[PDB]
Design a protein around this ligand. Structure first.
Ligand SMILES: OC[C@H]1O[C@H](O[C@H]2[C@H](O)[C@@H](O)[C@@H](O)O[C@@H]2CO)[C@H](O)[C@@H](O)[C@@H]1O
Ligand SMILES: OC[C@H]1O[C@H](O[C@H]2[C@H](O)[C@@H](O)[C@H](O)O[C@@H]2CO)[C@H](O)[C@@H](O)[C@@H]1O
Length: 490
């Protein structure tokens, strides 16, 4: 039955639906919009549950009232919800039309200790997320950064217990860094970065620097220092000593640093996921994380931008599959982006390979037998964008003899806006939803299309770093169709 080819579609709610004062501003307005999504066949919506709004007053001073009102409305409108534990700031990234900082009380500690923030070689502190360096430093009024995240999720679980039991919440996305993605803030627009700048390493806070120096000393090279020839945010790889041909990134020193740098992200995600699993144990929800799609410079040997962001991915080293393997122990979903981009749409001088990047990441996930979901990176309303998303959703097309051999677990569309609801744009969107659903009507019971959600089980045993890194072995991607068999048209 075709229903087995059904891929659910979710829509991101506007940023700031609940303002910085913790007030659900326009319920009536959101309601009319939600009802239109409901009529369009959309399966659910995604929303940021901002840490900076909820635990604003002080440590463990949570106020979940406004969000309870929002969830209640979503439920009344017949939509499911993907909730993001957003431990990051809204404001300094592309599309951030509202400013939502992390809790003021955390910012206050940052005043006396600037090293709780990601820091570049120049010493500029980025305040959008707490450096992985303090994950286990008990410097936040007695708590470590991870305990803060953990306490936040448990409070969410207990205070939204009725919504979790009623099956409103389907996925719990746990923000792991800037924009909620597991990465370093290597391309900060707030610091002048401009596409396709290679970005900068963000490991100069005293905690990360100390960890690195101890590490290299244990490796027999106490003299090794953090990168000093990697250039600046807007440089090109060839103009740097680190990324140029036969450059530093290929030396023993460089490989050690890059391994160290990327390993910090894997452990960061693994430790916080452990806490998310404990917090939601038994709940009928799946855990998920977001991996950024850094497609610029993907087509040159150095993969400069990926490296500075923390994805140690080269042509002979898979920097994403180990993330997928890590997620397997947590039975989590790998959410990737750039599902809408085509290589031809990128300036030639950016050496962009979004299509090949998507193929690599999705294949790695299916290879590790984990569920893969995704979203478009930029706002798109045209058929070509939708047709590319549909292609990636079912790379080898639909199967009439049963389920597709390859299919994404779901796709979340960025983002709900008046533009999307415009007669012509919305009309195209409705076709997009229909094709994602494999020409079937909206299906309220996920069980029908093999998406039944069982109680969250405890995470499997810890996987040692050496086993995770075995996943760096390059593999050939799964075959992709040149175009989808379920086109929207134009
Ligand atoms: O509301 C979700 C999320 O949206 C924005 O981040 C997106 C980004 O715009 C996309 O280009 C891609 O990178 O995925 C990101 C994560 O979904 C906001 O910047 C972010 O704060 C917010 O959580
Ligand atoms: O900021 C991260 C995103 O940067 C690029 O997006 C550019 C886009 O390429 C350009 O045409 C437009 O004018 O500005 C945006 C914002 O930087 C990448 O193309 C995206 O994949 C990144 O997510």
């Amino acid at each position: 039955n075709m229903l087995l080819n059904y891929v659910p579609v979710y829509v991101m709610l506007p940023l700031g639906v609940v303002n910085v004062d913790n007030v659900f501003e326009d319920p009536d307005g959101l309601k009319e919009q939600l009802l239109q999504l409901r009529a369009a066949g959309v399966d659910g919506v995604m929303v940021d549950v901002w840490w900076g709004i909820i635990e604003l007053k002080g440590p463990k001073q949570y106020d979940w009232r406004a969000y309870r009102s929002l969830l209640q409305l979503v439920q009344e409108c017949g939509l499911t919800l993907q909730a993001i534990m957003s431990f990051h700031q809204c404001g300094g990234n592309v599309g951030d039309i509202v400013n939502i900082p992390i809790p003021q009380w955390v910012l206050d500690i940052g005043e006396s200790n600037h090293d709780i923030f990601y820091t570049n070689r120049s010493g500029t502190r980025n305040k959008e997320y707490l450096t992985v360096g303090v994950d286990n430093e008990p410097i936040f009024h007695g708590r470590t950064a991870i305990e803060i995240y953990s306490d936040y999720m448990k409070s969410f679980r207990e205070n939204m217990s009725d919504f979790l039991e009623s099956g409103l919440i389907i996925d719990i996305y746990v923000g792991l860094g800037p924009a909620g993605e597991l990465r370093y803030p290597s391309y900060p627009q707030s610091q002048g970065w401009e596409f396709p700048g290679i970005g900068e390493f963000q490991c100069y806070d005293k905690y990360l620097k100390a960890d690195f120096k101890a590490a290299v000393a244990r490796a027999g090279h106490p003299e090794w220092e953090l990168p000093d020839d990697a250039g600046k945010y807007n440089d090109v790889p060839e103009s740097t000593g680190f990324f140029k041909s036969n450059g530093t990134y290929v030396t023993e020193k460089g490989k050690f640093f890059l391994t160290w740098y990327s390993n910090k992200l894997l452990n960061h995600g693994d430790q916080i996921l452990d806490e998310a699993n404990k917090a939601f144990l038994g709940c009928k929800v799946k855990l998920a994380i977001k991996v950024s799609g850094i497609h610029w410079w993907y087509k040159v040997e150095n993969h400069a931008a990926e490296l500075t962001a923390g994805y140690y991915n080269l042509n002979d080293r898979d920097g994403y599959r180990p993330i997928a393997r890590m997620l397997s122990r947590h039975h989590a979903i790998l959410n990737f982006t750039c599902l809408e981009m085509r290589d031809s749409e990128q300036p030639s001088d950016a050496k962009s390979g979004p299509q090949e990047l998507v193929q690599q990441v999705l294949s790695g996930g299916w290879r590790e037998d984990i569920r893969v979901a995704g979203e478009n990176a930029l706002p798109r309303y045209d058929a070509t964008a939708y047709n590319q998303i549909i292609l990636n959703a079912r790379p080898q097309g639909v199967n009439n003899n049963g389920p597709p051999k390859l299919s994404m677990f779901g796709v979340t569309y960025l983002r709900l806006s008046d533009d999307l609801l415009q007669k012509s744009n919305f009309n195209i969107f409705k076709k997009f939803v229909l094709k994602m659903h494999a020409d079937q009507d909206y299906c309220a019971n996920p069980q029908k299309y093999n998406h039944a959600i069982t109680p969250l089980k405890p995470s499997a045993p810890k996987i040692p770093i050496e086993v995770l890194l075995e996943a760096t072995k390059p593999t050939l991607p799964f075959p992709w169709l040149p175009e989808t068999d379920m086109k929207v048209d134009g």
